[PDB]
Amino acid sequence: XXXXXXXXRXXXXXXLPLX
């Protein structure tokens, strides 16, 4: 739940190296 949202979205919002 909590760690899921935290780490998941912190990875998504920097997952594309070109942006």
Partner 1 sequence: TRLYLKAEQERQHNYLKDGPYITAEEAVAVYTTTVHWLESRRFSPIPFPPLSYKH
Partner 2 sequence: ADRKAREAVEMRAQVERKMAQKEKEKHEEKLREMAQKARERRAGENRDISE
17 binds, among partner 1, partner 2, none (CB under 5 to 8 A by kind): partner 1
Minimum CB distance to partner 2, residue 2 (Å): 18
Instruction: Count residues near partner 2 (CB under 8 A).
Output: 6
Burial class of residue 1, CB neighbours in 10 A (0-12, 13-18, 19+): exposed
Residues 6+ apart with CB under 8 A from 4: none
Residues 1-19 as x/- pattern, contact with partner 2 by CB under 8 A: --------x--xx-xx--x
Pairwise CA distance, residues 7 & 3, whole Å: 6
Interaction of residue 18 with partner 1, rule CB under 8 A: yes
